[PDB]
Amino acid sequence: GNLTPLFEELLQQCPPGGQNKTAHMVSAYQLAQGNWMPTSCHVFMGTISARRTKTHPYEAYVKLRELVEEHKMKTLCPGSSLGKHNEWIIGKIKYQGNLRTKHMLNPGKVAEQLCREGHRHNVYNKTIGSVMTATGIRLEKLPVVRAQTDTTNFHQAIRDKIDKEENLQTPGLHKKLMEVFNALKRPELESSYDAVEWEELERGINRKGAAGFFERKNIGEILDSEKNKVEEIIDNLKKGRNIKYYETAIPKNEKRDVNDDWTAGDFVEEKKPRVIQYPEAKTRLAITKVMYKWVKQKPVVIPGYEGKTPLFQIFDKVKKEWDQFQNPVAVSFDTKAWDTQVTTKDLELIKDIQKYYFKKKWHKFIDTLTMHMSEVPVISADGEVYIRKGQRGSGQPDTSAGNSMLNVLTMIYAFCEATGVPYKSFDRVAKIHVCGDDGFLITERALGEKFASKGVQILYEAGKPQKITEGDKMKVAYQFDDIEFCSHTPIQVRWSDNTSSYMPGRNTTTILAKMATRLDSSGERGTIAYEKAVAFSFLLMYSWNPLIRRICLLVLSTELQVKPGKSTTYYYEGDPISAYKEVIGHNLFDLKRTSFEKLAKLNLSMSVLGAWTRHTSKRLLQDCVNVGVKEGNWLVNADRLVSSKTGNRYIPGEGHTLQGRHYEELV
Predict the structure, then answer these.
(1) Which end of the chain is least crowded, N or C, by CB within 10 Å?
(2) How does it assemble (predicted)?
């Protein structure tokens, strides 16, 4: 009836309960339509037990609201204990605590020092910047802000996100998730994973990887001296012996996009930090050395895992899936603060999966580590200790693998339970794609809409509450380029071939913001070299954007004799226009037309926020043309329009795309 959305809202507040085969279980719609009187607020698949009695919708509503409030009353005052294996941390406490934490224990402080403050304003790449501002782009106006890392806001962040009990989850959920796992295990690899050699582990490793609160040496330093310390940790865990597990909590210093805020009118100028929580460097080494093939997905055993797919390939890959369905539709995964939603039972389910794949000799390792992870003492940067109840800390080696598996398992479960499709038959009916907590699913419109409705409830009960659209549903893409994934959305280009591919689209404002700014000045981060590598990396992602493309081209044109740096995501070797060709599969020159409407939308905010002038495009074009009319071979002539107007072309020499960081698998 009229009141269905209200009942939906209330069912998102009830405690998850189990099946009840012996009672009249009824849904929000049912309650809203009439003569059902709630008896429980224990909710199961969006349904609660009700008597069949003359009852008006408003009356049923009042009753359920009363039941929910009663439960909330039973539930204040829950208590936070500290398990014996964590008692060691108290020995290090020296002052009393000031976290004012409400749901986890805050025994006190260790040092009283680092009670930092300040702002952190934006740092600018000189060359990139002058290319942009010489055309009327104003860096000031780009909706990018910094993460306030002062202790006050840092604590506010902790209380905001991490101070919370483990989510209640539907009884027997994890039995069910293991059934889902069972339909996608790889028997081919049971009991097979073993540790790796320091050789392998070090290859590509980040030697600047940071140290724990009680830790003087970073990853490089540990590798040079204390491999024996690390091997000791490995042996303790290997045997079942507790270790002094703890995690360090620092506010993540980063650039924060505020495009949507500024265009609304709300002109936010700082944002509360995300919270990084990571174990000791010695301990990250100890975990990764043993669990390398799981934590790094070597091989990938998580269906839909896209951790290893380059961003410029993903959408093309996905469109091949979209094209196989009669009325394709994509339901978007969007869990609120995923990391803070992960419960001990979740961690345990990953523990059991890990034990499926690892050799028996390491089971006791996994057990002991999983246990440590279920109640984690965390020292903040400024000294405050808090005892986290479950959850996930971003710095954990298992973060990316664990989350992704957990996300897939949960979303399949939810999809199936919403639709009727058995867990074994998921492959028959939909396609899934996860990168950590991010992801989506592709399926037939009927099943996708079912999922998008029954999903918010089911996922709430599963312990992974969503974020929703005005219709209180999961976000649904009815046309391919409305998919959103890894902060991007597909945009179509058409080549001189007359073929077409999809590239990773994103607001122009955000692209310029990210491209113009930098965090440090350490590594190659001062030089033109680093800027050329940034331009190349952007050119791989954003060649569909004539503005970004032309800016990148002009940057790559600067100081021809200077080889690019290796710090950023991708870099190049030889000629960047070729490298482009090598991994995009056409030449820049072939890019005939970018999809008009999607490009207009991703450009819109630029005008709304006054980040460019009426003549910016024109001026940037002219800037390219002035370089490209000169006699000779000028890489700005790789731009189809530039070349058209200069009457010259660019003849690329040899070149190859390379990687300096994350580590993916190119085609």
Answers:
(1) C
(2) Homodimer; disulfide-linked. Interacts with host RPSA.
